[PDB]
Structures are given as structure tokens and as C-alpha cells.
Amino acid sequence: ITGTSTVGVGRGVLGDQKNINTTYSTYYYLQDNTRGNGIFTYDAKYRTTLPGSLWADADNQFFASYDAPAVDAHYYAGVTYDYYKNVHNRLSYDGNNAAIRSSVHYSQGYNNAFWNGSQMVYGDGDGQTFIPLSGGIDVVAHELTHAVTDYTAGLIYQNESGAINEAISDIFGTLVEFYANKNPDWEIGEDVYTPGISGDSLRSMSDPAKYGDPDHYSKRYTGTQDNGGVHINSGIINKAAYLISQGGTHYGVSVVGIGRDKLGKIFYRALTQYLTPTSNFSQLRAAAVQSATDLYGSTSQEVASVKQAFDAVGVK
Ligand SMILES: [Ca+2]
Ligand SMILES: [Ca+2]
Ligand SMILES: [Ca+2]
Ligand SMILES: [Ca+2]
Ligand SMILES: [Zn+2]
């Protein structure tokens, strides 16, 4: 909408106060004009018709319980935009400052979030498996990263290419969580998963097997559930990424860690310069090796560590 840029204040899903960029035109709308061609947050009103209505508020204060998922979807989309722009020189998901749109309060009891080809969508959860999923910064960045993937490598959402697609979203979701630097970890979704159980998460990158996901190619899932295991076999790539950054010895193979920033540079370059819609795990290894060679040189520790990490998870 046309209006003037304003700054509201509200509380997110976890009860924390934050400022949010809004737009005033009769109402105050969740429309942040400070980033690209805007970040826009919509109310789906417990229905499944998208996007719903651009979020309107009478007083620019967003402290109601119903407001909390919108505050966080809007704010964390801004953090994710900032990460891509400041760290990777990428302007929104398409590289051309496309408007970023999210809807919250999608459906009833909906235990998921997704990119639908055009926008982000967040359930409220059922209060048992999830609370409203935009409360997780890694979740928000996971969803926006699907849009980045779709505009770049275009990884098809099935089998190995789909597991790479998933791992890319978990990797950058985690790197955005570290960028914001509030309780960062290598776990996925811990801030919104299972409110009655402490210390768990939906997936772990440091130890995928903790939640039944493979940590070695020999343990890959080859059935048809979950689009051929896209959220399962992602554990193999997530583990490799964790090892590249943090190091470790895994199935007897030692990896020298090179840190998060270099991990992000290598995988961003792989995603945007080398991967294709049909890339498999072996082709990802090659893309990561070439990316690290471009950035750091063929004789670098960074290249050697990429090779070590893929060896450790059984990907040649
Ligand atoms: Ca209000
Ligand atoms: Ca965390
Ligand atoms: Ca996390
Ligand atoms: Ca929990
Ligand atoms: Zn995903």
C-alpha cells in the first residue's frame, strides 16, 4: 500500500519485545519499506486461502496474542533479507529485490511452514508438536531459503536433489540464526518444537541420528515417503556442512573445521554457480570442492576440509 514508513513495537511468539517496520495509511500495516521492494505480512485468518489480508493494526502496537506470529514472521524475514544482502550481496530471493510476502495463522492446528512457489506460509501448530512456527528464526530463514534455491539452482524436490534442497534450507536457516546471535545452535526448529519437552528439536545437524536421520550415505533412505526422504537424507548433507564448519572425527574420518563464515561462502557459491535442478550428492561434493577452490585455492585447507567432510559422510 502507499503510505509513510513507521516503526511499531510488539511481542513475538516467545514473549520478546521488538520493533517492526510498518506503513501508515489509515491503519498501520505490516509492510516494511526499508528492505528492497518491501516485506509484507498477511493474516490468513485460520483459513487456507492465500495470501489473506495485508496485516492491519489500528495503533502500531502489536502485543496481542493473535499478533505474535505476525510480529515474528515480519521481523525474521527482515533479518533473513539482511543476511543475504550483507553477507552474500544478494538482494532478496530473486537477486532483484522481489517483494517478500508471508502469511500467518494458516489453517487450524497446522504443524508446518512452507514456501508455496510465491510466498511463505506459517501454521500456528497444534500447541503440542509446534507453537506458531514463525517464532523460529531458523524456520523463517529455512522457508525464505527455499525461494532462493528455486530462483538459483532450482533443485527438484525429490530424492537426492530434494535432500540437497532441504539441507541448503537447514544450513542457511542455521547461519541466519547465528547471524542474529540469539541462542544459536546447529539444531532445527528448537524454539517452536514441542513446548512440553525441553532440549529437543525437529532435526539436528550436529548429530542427525539423534532424531533417526542418516549421518552417512550408507544409511540413506531409498523409499517413497517424504518425496523420497527429502527431510531424512538431508541429514547426510547437514552433517557434512556441520563438519566443514566445526570439525570432528566421524566414522573414523577427521575433518579440520574452517568456521561458519567459510561454510556459508562455499555453499552459497555452490548453490548459485554450480548446482542444477537435478544435482545429486556426488555432484554437490564436486560443486563444493570447486567453490572452495575458486574462493581459497586448490591447495587450501578449505578445499581439503570439504573433501574430508564428504568422505566422512560417505559421499564420493
Ligand atoms: Ca494494536
Ligand atoms: Ca537456537
Ligand atoms: Ca536452531
Ligand atoms: Ca521442545
Ligand atoms: Zn524445507
From Swiss-Prot:
Record has Metal-binding as a keyword: yes
Entry binding sites for Zn(2+): 142, 146, 166
Binding site for Ca(2+) 4: 193-194, 197, 200
Reactions catalysed according to its record: Preferential cleavage: Xaa-|-Leu > Xaa-|-Phe
Record keywords, A-Z: Calcium, Hydrolase, Metal-binding, Metalloprotease, Protease, Secreted, Signal, Zinc, Zymogen
Active site (catalytic residues): 143, 231 (proton donor)
One GO CC term, this protein: extracellular region
EC numbers: 3.4.24.27
Intracellular or extracellular location(s): Secreted
Record-listed Ca(2+) 3 binding positions: 177, 183, 185, 190
Cofactor: Ca(2+); Zn(2+)
Biological processes, Gene Ontology terms: proteolysis
Sequence positions that bind Ca(2+) 2: 138, 177, 185, 187, 190
Temperature dependence: Thermostable.
Binding-site residues for Ca(2+) 1, renumbered to this chain: 57, 59, 61
Family recorded in the similarity comment: Belongs to the peptidase M4 family.
Described purpose of this protein according to its UniProt entry: Extracellular zinc metalloprotease.
Name under which the protein is recorded: Thermolysin
Gene name, Swiss-Prot/TrEMBL: npr
Location of this fragment in the whole protein: 233 to 548 of 548
